[PDB]
Amino acid sequence: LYNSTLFSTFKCYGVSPSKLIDLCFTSVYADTFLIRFSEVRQVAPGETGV
Amino acid sequence: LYNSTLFSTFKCYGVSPSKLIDLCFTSVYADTFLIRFSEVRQVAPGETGVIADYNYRLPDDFTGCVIAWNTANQDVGSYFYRSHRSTKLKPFERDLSSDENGVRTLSTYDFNPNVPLDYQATRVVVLSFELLNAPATVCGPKLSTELVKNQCVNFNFNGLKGTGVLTSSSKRFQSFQQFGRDASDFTDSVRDPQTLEIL
Amino acid sequence: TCLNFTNLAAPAYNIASSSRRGVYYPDDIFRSDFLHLVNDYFLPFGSNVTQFFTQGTNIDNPTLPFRDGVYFAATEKSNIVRGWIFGSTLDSTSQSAIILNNSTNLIVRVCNFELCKVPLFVVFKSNNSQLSHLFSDSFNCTFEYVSRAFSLDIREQSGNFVDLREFVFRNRNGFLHIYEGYEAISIVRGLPAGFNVLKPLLKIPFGLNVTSFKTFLAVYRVAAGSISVASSAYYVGYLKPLTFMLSYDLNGTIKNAVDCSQDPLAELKCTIKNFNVSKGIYQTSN
Ligand SMILES: C=CC1=C(C)/C(=C/c2[nH]c(Cc3[nH]c(/C=C4\NC(=O)C(C)=C4C=C)c(C)c3CCC(=O)O)c(CCC(=O)O)c2C)NC1=O
Numbered sequence: 398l399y400n401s402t403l404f405s406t407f408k409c410y411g412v413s414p415s416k417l418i419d420l421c422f423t424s425v426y427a428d429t430f431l432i433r434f435s436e437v438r439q440v441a442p443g444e445t446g447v
Numbered sequence: 448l449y450n451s452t453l454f455s456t457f458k459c460y461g462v463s464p465s466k467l468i469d470l471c472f473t474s475v476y477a478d479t480f481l482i483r484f485s486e487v488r489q490v491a492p493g494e495t496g497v498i499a500d501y502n503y504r505l506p507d508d509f510t511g512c513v514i515a516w517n518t519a520n521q522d523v524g525s526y527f528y529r530s531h532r533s534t535k536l537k538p539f540e541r542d543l544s545s546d547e548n549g550v551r552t553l554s555t556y557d558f559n560p561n562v563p564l565d566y567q568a569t570r571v572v573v574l575s576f577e578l579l580n581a582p583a584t585v586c587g588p589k590l591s592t593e594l595v596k597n598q599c600v601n602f603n604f605n606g607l608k609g610t611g612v613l614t615s616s617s618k619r620f621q622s623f624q625q626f627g628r629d630a631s632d633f634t635d636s637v638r639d640p641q642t643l644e645i646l
Numbered sequence: 647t648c649l650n651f652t653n654l655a656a657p658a659y660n661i662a663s664s665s666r667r668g669v670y671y672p673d674d675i676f677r678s679d680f681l682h683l684v685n686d687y688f689l690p691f692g693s694n695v696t697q698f699f700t701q702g703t704n705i706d707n708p709t710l711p712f713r714d715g716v717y718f719a720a721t722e723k724s725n726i727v728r729g730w731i732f733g734s735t736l737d738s739t740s741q742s743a744i745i746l747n748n749s750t751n752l753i754v755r756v757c758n759f760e761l762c763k764v765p766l767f768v769v770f771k772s773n774n775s776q777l778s779h780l781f782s783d784s785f786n787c788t789f790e791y792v793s794r795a796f797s798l799d800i801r802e803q804s805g806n807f808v809d810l811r812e813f814v815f816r817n818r819n820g821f822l823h824i825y826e827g828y829e830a831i832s833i834v835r836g837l838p839a840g841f842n843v844l845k846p847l848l849k850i851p852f853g854l855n856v857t858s859f860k861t862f863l864a865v866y867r868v869a870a871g872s873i874s875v876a877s878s879a880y881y882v883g884y885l886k887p888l889t890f891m892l893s894y895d896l897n898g899t900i901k902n903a904v905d906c907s908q909d910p911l912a913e914l915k916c917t918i919k920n921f922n923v924s925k926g927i928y929q930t931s932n
Pocket residue numbers: 725726727728729745746747752811824826847
């Protein structure tokens with residue numbers, strides 16, 4: 398995805414980035430939705446907001 | 448630069464801001480390049496992405512500051528970046544190979560004011576410094592005051608400590624060091640930074 | 647322009663053993679009467695290095711690997727060994743850095759060099775002893791350094807090696823660290839056993855992927871026109887991740903060191919952190 402996508406937010410919890418290459422995950426799930434640009438900061442553990 | 452510039456990013460590592468005024472840095476280097484606005488978050492120690500491993504990589508024990516600001520309506524040409532590589536780069540390393548023999552490795556982006564905010568051109572300046580037992584030659588705007596002795600005073604020979612100051616006449620220095628080192632990782636008998644008199 | 651050679655002999659990878667050689671300062675902090683352990687990259691005590699010499703119809707300048715750091719030591723009289731080139735694949739497809747001494751200036755420059763097969767300096771015995779070409783071409787690049795001018799003697803035959811120059815090269819965070827040391831000698835055969843610390847000299851920012859290196863030599867052209875080589879030798883060793891135990895004294899100089907992985911006595915010395923051991927039986931760490 399390096400030459401086709403541009404991500405403005407990439408935050409990982411419980412595992413550091415640049416370590417996902419040499420790791421195996423046993424149960425992966427993906428959740429998708431669509432919000433406003435200012436509400437991305439509310440998608441985090443222990444946050445508040447609408 | 449307070450009445451001329453406006454920085455969107457000012458993050459320092461290994462030293463807090465509002466302390467750079469009263470500090471001296473021995474070896475100072477500046478790295479300059481140009482990326483998109485959304486890729487500024489990748490210029491950090493320990494990050495991932497197309498910039499952090501194929502174009503520019505910071506060491507883990509990094510000391511310095513990262514400064515970025517948007518420069519639309521100033522940079523209009525077409526610029527290039529590395530999209531893929533066989534391996535990832537070492538810290539503070541370059542790869543000037545414009546193309547491989549098999550396939551081209553350099554992808555391009557075009558910068559224009561009409562392009563969206565996520566794809567706009569910003570300038571990034573990265574500084575790096577360290578502190579040794581040597582003259583620094585890069586200091587802040589501090590004025591030397593009167594030297595007093597035989598009292599409990601706080602001295603600022605590039606480092607803060609509050610003791611009593613006397614005259615030393617039995618010290619042998621190596622003409623590089625300012626303070627030296629003791630057995631318990633202590634610094635004693637500091638030097639006047641412009642003279643050779645050892646306190 | 648570069649020369650032609652057909653009577654060159656293949657190098658013989660002779661084996662000579664170092665002994666307490668290749669110790670450099672790890673930190674720029676003045677310490678006196680100190681003693682502490684350091685885990686870094688060092689040349690192992692008692693390890694064997696490879697021998698290359700230029701004696702007769704035998705010029706030995708091959709491309710050698712740059713794994714984790716190189717110990718370089720040269721025993722010469724007539725200034726045969728001049729400098730080195732560092733880089734990857736040593737051609738025009740990538741960038742390479744040189745450190746050179748052309749008997750007038752010290753040259754530090756990294757460009758897109760195109761090296762020939764046998765890069766040598768040529769000195770005329772007659773004709774007031776000028777220098778000559780090194781390589782073919784080098785296009786655009788982004789670094790320069792020319793030092794001050796000096797005069798260098800470029801011919802002397804004493805019969806015995808009188809100079810010993812030792813170097814340690816390291817690559818870390820885009821910097822090339824250089825540690826230097828000099829010692830007067832009088833030998834005929836090989837690498838003398840001894841001990842001398844090396845001081846930090848250079849720190850050049852390159853940003854280069856360094857995997858190989860090659861050395862620059864010098865030869866002589868006789869008045870008839872043929873080439874004649876002069877006696878010289880150099881040795882190459884590699885650094886390994888090891889634990890050492892250095893000592894400091896008055897004036898803050900390193901005077902002794904112990905490689906903790908050599909023998910059980912060195913392990914015992916590193917365990918109790920002392921050069922002198924009394925009689926008894928002691929438990930040692932690994
Ligand atoms: C290109 C790398 C290079 C380095 C880093 C270098 C360092 C270097 N060379 C010398 C002297 C120094 N260097 C040389 C010559 C050489 N020294 C060598 O490492 C080599 C390869 C030659 C040439 C064959 C001489 C003949 C002297 C003595 C100069 C004097 O008598 O003042 C010093 C001490 C200066 C002083 O205290 O007077 C240093 C730091 N020389 C170099 O050429």
